[PDB]
From a paper:
LH2 complexes are oligomers of a basic α/β-apoprotein dimer, each of which binds noncovalently three molecules of bacteriochlorophyll a (BChl a) and one or two molecules of carotenoids. Overall, the cryo-EM maps and the corresponding models of the four LH2 complexes are very similar, all with a ring-like structure in which nine α/β-heterodimers oligomerize to form a nonameric complex. The most unusual structural feature of these four LH2 complexes is the hitherto unknown γ-polypeptide, which partially encircles the LH2 complex toward its cytoplasmic side.
Only the pucBAc gene pair is unable to produce a functional LH complex, so we could purify four different LH2 complexes that will be referred as PucA-LH2, PucB-LH2, PucD-LH2, and PucE-LH2 from this point onward. The absorption spectra of the three other Rps. palustris LH2 complexes are essentially the same and have two strong near-IR absorption peaks at 804 and 856 nm, corresponding to the well-known B800 and B850 BChl a Qy bands. SDS-PAGE also shows that the α-polypeptide of PucB-LH2 is slightly larger than those in other complexes, consistent with its predicted sequence, and that there is a faint lower–molecular weight form of this α-polypeptide possibly arising from partial posttranslational processing. We used AlphaFold 2 (34) to calculate a model for the α- and β-apoproteins in the PucB-LH2, which shows that the 17 untraced C-terminal residues of this α-polypeptide form a unstructured membrane-extrinsic domain. The B850 pairs in PucA-LH2, PucB-LH2, and PucE-LH2 from Rps. palustris have H-bond patterns similar to that in the LH2 from Rbl. acidophilus 10050.
Numbering used by the authors:
A (entry chain J), B (entry chain H), C (entry chain F), D (entry chain D), E (entry chain B), F (entry chain R), ...: 3 to 51
J (entry chain S): 4 to 97
K (entry chain A), L (entry chain C), M (entry chain Q), N (entry chain E), O (entry chain O), P (entry chain G), ...: 1 to 49
The structure:
Amino acid sequence: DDPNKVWPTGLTIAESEELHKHVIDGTRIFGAIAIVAHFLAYVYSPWLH
Amino acid sequence: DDPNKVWPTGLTIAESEELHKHVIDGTRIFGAIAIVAHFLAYVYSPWLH
Amino acid sequence: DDPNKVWPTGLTIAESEELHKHVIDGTRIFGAIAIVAHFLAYVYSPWLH
Amino acid sequence: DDPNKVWPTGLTIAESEELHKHVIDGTRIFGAIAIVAHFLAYVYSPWLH
Amino acid sequence: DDPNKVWPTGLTIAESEELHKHVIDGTRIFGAIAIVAHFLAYVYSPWLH
Amino acid sequence: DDPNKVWPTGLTIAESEELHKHVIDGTRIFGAIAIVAHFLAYVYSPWLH
Amino acid sequence: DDPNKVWPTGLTIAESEELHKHVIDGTRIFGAIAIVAHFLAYVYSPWLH
Amino acid sequence: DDPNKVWPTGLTIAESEELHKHVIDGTRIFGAIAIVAHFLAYVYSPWLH
Amino acid sequence: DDPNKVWPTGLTIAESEELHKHVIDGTRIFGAIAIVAHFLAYVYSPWLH
Amino acid sequence: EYKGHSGHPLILKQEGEYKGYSGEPLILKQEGEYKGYSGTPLILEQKGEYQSFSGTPLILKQEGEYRGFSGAPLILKQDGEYKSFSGYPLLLNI
Amino acid sequence: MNQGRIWTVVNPGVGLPLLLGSVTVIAILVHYAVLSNTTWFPKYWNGAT
Amino acid sequence: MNQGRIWTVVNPGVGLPLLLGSVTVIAILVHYAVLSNTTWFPKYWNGAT
Amino acid sequence: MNQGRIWTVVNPGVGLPLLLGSVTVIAILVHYAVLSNTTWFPKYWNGAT
Amino acid sequence: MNQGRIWTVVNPGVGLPLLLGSVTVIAILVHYAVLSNTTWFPKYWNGAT
Amino acid sequence: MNQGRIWTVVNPGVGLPLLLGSVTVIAILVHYAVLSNTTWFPKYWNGAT
Amino acid sequence: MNQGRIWTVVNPGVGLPLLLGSVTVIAILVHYAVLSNTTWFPKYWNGAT
Amino acid sequence: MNQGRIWTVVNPGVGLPLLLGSVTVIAILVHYAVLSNTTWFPKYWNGAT
Amino acid sequence: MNQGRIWTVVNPGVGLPLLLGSVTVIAILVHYAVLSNTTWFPKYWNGAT
Amino acid sequence: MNQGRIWTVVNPGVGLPLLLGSVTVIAILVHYAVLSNTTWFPKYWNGAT
Ligand code: BCL
Ligand code: BCL
Ligand code: BCL
Ligand code: BCL
Ligand code: BCL
Ligand code: BCL
Ligand SMILES: CC(C)=CCC/C(C)=C/C=C/C(C)=C/C=C/C(C)=C/C=C/C=C(C)/C=C/C=C(C)/C=C/C=C(\C)CCCC(C)(C)O
Ligand SMILES: CC(C)=CCC/C(C)=C/C=C/C(C)=C/C=C/C(C)=C/C=C/C=C(C)/C=C/C=C(C)/C=C/C=C(\C)CCCC(C)(C)O
Ligand SMILES: CC(C)=CCC/C(C)=C/C=C/C(C)=C/C=C/C(C)=C/C=C/C=C(C)/C=C/C=C(C)/C=C/C=C(\C)CCCC(C)(C)O
Ligand SMILES: CC(C)=CCC/C(C)=C/C=C/C(C)=C/C=C/C(C)=C/C=C/C=C(C)/C=C/C=C(C)/C=C/C=C(\C)CCCC(C)(C)O
Ligand SMILES: CC(C)=CCC/C(C)=C/C=C/C(C)=C/C=C/C(C)=C/C=C/C=C(C)/C=C/C=C(C)/C=C/C=C(\C)CCCC(C)(C)O
């Protein structure tokens, strides 16, 4: 292998992994907001009551 | 790394961040107008009453 | 920076801003006609009556 | 400026303006026919009666 | 100007005009058949009766 | 003019005309089968009865 | 003419005809299976009864 | 003919035939699972009963 | 054959197989979560009861 | 490097072969010819002319001009300017 | 008959299929419209009671 | 009449088919709207009772 | 039979699939129309009462 | 009035047709909405009872 | 059987997927048509009363 | 405010039209939803009884 | 089994996604068909009466 | 968190707009589902009786 | 597990987005199906009577 290898997308392995950190953080941030939204829905809607 | 590196989109890092300032400011402008629209809707519609 | 820089769209900054003058003026013209159309709708339709 | 400048579409300013003459004249022709069609509709349909 | 100028579509002015003769003639032929079809519809359907 | 001129589609005039012979012959054959299908529909369905 | 002429699709006349043999044979096999399917439908469904 | 001839897709005849082995095997495996699914449907659903 | 042969997608055989390991592992992880979801659905819904 | 808000870690490192979370093996190797699970043969080899299953012939050979099955002529020859069928003129040239 | 130069800026390979296609689609839409909004057109197909 | 330079940045091969196409689609939509929301337009086609 | 030169400006790889495709789509639409607006066509499939 | 540089990264040949097209589509949607959810708009077209 | 040269002007990579795709779509459409317009086909799936 | 580098891998000529377009489509969908699921929004347009 | 050479004229990157995609779409269509036209399939999901 | 190398074979300019776009579409679909299949969600918007 | 070489002929930039996209679409379709054809799933969201 070669860490300097430019892959067909133009990104190196290090660049692809650094990019994915934004995707994982974005997913976790979306999940945290969704968890609060589900808690509010449970507290105010008749769901699960 | 190199701050002068032209990425596959043709924009440099400095150019991409300068562009995003318009997106962030545009989102804030859209949000402010939407907040006023929600206040008007609450005052005049039966929602939340 | 360089004002002569041709951007990926082929337009320079001066050319893009000159083009946008038509979009801003066009939006104002569309808005002016829409304001008159809303006045006619209010005068003749039962909306807001 | 340069009137001989070939723009990205391949047309010069003079060629673009000459082309637009057909669009403006075509719009006027479509408008004239539409005005007659609206006159016939008023004379024969119950609209505005 | 130059009558030999090959335009972006690859056709010259003379070739574009010669092509349009088929479109104009084709439109006239379609119109002629449509006129007959409308006559038959009037004779056999209750439209305009 | 020149009959050997390769047009933008890659076909010569003679090749385009030879190709069109199949389109005309195919249209005539489709028409013949459609005529028989319409005859069968008339003989067996209540259409035109 | 030249039978070795590579046409715009990349196939020669001989290669295009050889390919069409599979299309004709595939059409005939599809027809044979469709004929049996229509026979079974007639024997078991109320169609044509 | 030439078995080394690279065709327009980039695959040789031998490579295309080897690829088709996966397509045929995949079809046969899909069929076997579909046969079991139809047997289970027959045993548990009212179809064919 | 040659394991260093770059195929039309740009991936070598070794790279395609290493990529597929993520596809198989992803399918197995998706399946495991789906199995738990089906167990919860059975325990809480009237399905299969 | 990126400093996310949702704590750390954000990604898992990999210095070699991918390790499956769902155990192993993850793929099956091949020593040569594809070994199908649905028995053999998987394909029929072609030694020459395409051996049809629905009899022969499969195509009609063409010699010279196209032999129209719906009589003749199939096209109208054009010499010079286009012969209008809806009278004249057909254009208003500039 | 004065728009003959349109084929110098609109590609015939695009504009001719769109023209013939749109004319055909409009004709189908007019048939479906009269069929859905009239009683005599469906009765014509139903024929003998 | 002052937008004539639009064809220097918008390709006529794209903007002219879209213009003529959109104008035609809008006309069809207006016909369907008046046809669906009025009694006199369908009765006009139905003609004699 | 006089339009044979259309294949010099319309690419057969595009116009022939569109022709055969459109003719087939039109035929399907006519079948669905007569099937939906008549009683004898659905009854034909229903066969024995 | 401060977004004039958007045409340096968004191609006018794309953004201008999309802008003018979207504005037109939105206007159509608002007309259809008021037409479907009000009695005075359809009555306006129906006119004299 | 005389159309074998169509593959010299229609690319097999386009015409063969379109053919097999269209034939499959037509078959699906005929099944849905007979299923919706007959009582015996849905009853066949419903099986035992 | 930390995603400013997204424009180095996502082309602004694509992502900016998609962002502005999607935001506009979402607003339309929310308006249609409240209009269809409430009585006060349509009554607002209907105005005077 | 004799069609193995199809991959010399149909690109696997196109034909394989289309094949696997179509087969999946067909399966979905058959499930929706039996679900809509039978009582036992929806009752199976409804479970306990 | 181990799929970080996916951006070496999937272009971020495509996969990131598709990811964010799909997530947004799914949220819209879930909102429409709960809105159509519950009474408390529409009643929440209707507010005061 | 033996199909690992598919990525040598199917581009991962296409097949991976299609796979993950299709799987997500299938899940949405199954949720909509059970929601529409069962009473307990909508009742679950409606919660307390
Ligand atoms: C404040 C909420 C932040 C957050 C802030 C932190 C902090 C601070 C830490 C971590 C740490 C961790 N986080 Mg985090 N993290 C969040 C979302 C997530 C989600 C997810 C929702 O799917 C996951 C799987 C993770 C994953 C993880 C691990 C990598 C790590 C160790 C385990 C752990 O749970 O620690 C404990 C994690 C928590 C107590 C929070 C988990 C998220 C909860 C469930 C979100 C609900 C809403 C929250 C209460 C209020 C915010 C609402 C706003 C509207 C967003 N984070 C959100 C975006 N995370 C820890 C670590 O090891 O860092 C080095 C750590 O110190
Ligand atoms: C804990 C849930 C994890 C998981 C963790 C493990 C672990 C841990 C091991 C395997 C091992 C194996 N796994 Mg795994 N695996 C899961 C999902 C799957 C799925 C699937 C859902 O479709 C499949 C087909 C497989 C496939 C396999 C085989 C390659 C192998 C079993 C060989 C054997 O005979 O072992 C005989 C049995 C054993 C050695 C021990 C028991 C392992 C059993 C067979 C795992 C069954 C998982 C089951 C299908 C899914 C349960 C999901 C839960 C309901 C959440 N995994 C999920 C993601 N898997 C084993 C192996 O060979 O690794 C080298 C192993 O040790
Ligand atoms: C275990 C189920 C496996 C399978 C395993 C095998 C095995 C094992 C063998 C074959 C062999 C053959 N298979 Mg296989 N095969 C399956 C699916 C298929 C399907 C299909 C579903 O459409 C087809 C058309 C074929 C085609 C064929 C022929 C190329 C060949 C000769 C069969 C025959 O009747 O020989 C005449 C009869 C016999 C030789 C003995 C009896 C039949 C044997 C046992 C194979 C029957 C498979 C049957 C169609 C599967 C139906 C689905 C299952 C019931 C669930 N396979 C599935 C995926 N196949 C055989 C061969 O010739 O290999 C060299 C062989 O030994
Ligand atoms: C077994 C079913 C096979 C089949 C096997 C054969 C065989 C075997 C032969 C042909 C032969 C012929 N086939 Mg074939 N063929 C089938 C499907 C078709 C279909 C179609 C369904 O649309 C067509 C149009 C054809 C076309 C033809 C002609 C080129 C030729 C018959 C005329 C002639 O010169 O006969 C001259 C020969 C004879 C008169 C001998 C008797 C042939 C009989 C009449 C069978 C003809 C095929 C018949 C239409 C198939 C119907 C199948 C349905 C399932 C019922 N085949 C299917 C896929 N075909 C014949 C030929 O010329 O081969 C060199 C031949 O011997
Ligand atoms: C057998 C059915 C075949 C067919 C076989 C033939 C044959 C055989 C001949 C023609 C000939 C002609 N055909 Mg052809 N043709 C068919 C379909 C068509 C269709 C169509 C359905 O739209 C059209 C427009 C044509 C067009 C024509 C002309 C080019 C030409 C007559 C010139 C003239 O003035 O003759 C004046 C009149 C005559 C010479 C004699 C009487 C007419 C002859 C018998 C042709 C009538 C065909 C008729 C239009 C379509 C019948 C369809 C069936 C009822 C299903 N064919 C189908 C596919 N055609 C003729 C020609 O000139 O060939 C060199 C000829 O001999
Ligand atoms: C037979 C049906 C043919 C047809 C055959 C002819 C013939 C034959 C002639 C023309 C001529 C003319 N045609 Mg033409 N034409 C048709 C369809 C059309 C349509 C249309 C439907 O939209 C249009 C706009 C035209 C346009 C014209 C003019 C350019 C010109 C008359 C100008 C003049 O000097 O008048 C005064 C001219 C005369 C009094 C001579 C006779 C004019 C004929 C009667 C005009 C018929 C047009 C009419 C709209 C056709 C309706 C369809 C039928 C009901 C089937 N044609 C169809 C396709 N056309 C003429 C020409 O070329 O002049 C130089 C001519 O001689
Ligand atoms: C649906 C409900 C209920 C409600 C909705 C209500 C609603 C919103 C309605 C809205 C309606 C609107 C907006 C209508 C707008 C209509 C317009 C604008 C029409 C315009 C017509 C233009 C034409 C005809 C142009 C022809 C151009 C032409 C022929 C150009 C020719 C060019 C050439 C020859 C090239 C030259 C090359 C070289 C220079 C070298 O010579
Ligand atoms: C839905 C409801 C209720 C209401 C809606 C109502 C409503 C709005 C309806 C609107 C209807 C409209 C607008 C209809 C318009 C119809 C028109 C315009 C028809 C035009 C037909 C044109 C034809 C037939 C052209 C043939 C061209 C041809 C054959 C060209 C051939 C070219 C060649 C051979 C190349 C030569 C190359 C070389 C020069 C080198 O030789
Ligand atoms: C919906 C309701 C109620 C009402 C709506 C009613 C309504 C509006 C209906 C309208 C219907 C219409 C308009 C129908 C029109 C039908 C037509 C036009 C059919 C045409 C068929 C053409 C065929 C079959 C062509 C085959 C070509 C072929 C085989 C070509 C072969 C070429 C080759 C071999 C290449 C050679 C290369 C080299 C020269 C080098 O050898
Ligand atoms: C229909 C019914 C009834 C029911 C349906 C039920 C059903 C099936 C539901 C399914 C739901 C599912 C599956 C939900 C899934 C949700 C997911 C996965 C959310 C993911 C969010 C991801 C985010 C937010 C990513 C942000 C990325 C970001 C910001 C990336 C930034 C990148 C940068 C800056 C480039 C840097 C480059 C360099 C570093 C080189 O400079
Ligand atoms: C309608 C009704 C009632 C009923 C409908 C009934 C019906 C038909 C249902 C059908 C259902 C079906 C068929 C379901 C199928 C589900 C499947 C197959 C799921 C597959 C999941 C796959 C995954 C999760 C893949 C992840 C890949 C991944 C993460 C890949 C990562 C790759 C990387 C990192 C690149 C590395 C590159 C390098 C190594 C070179 O560096």
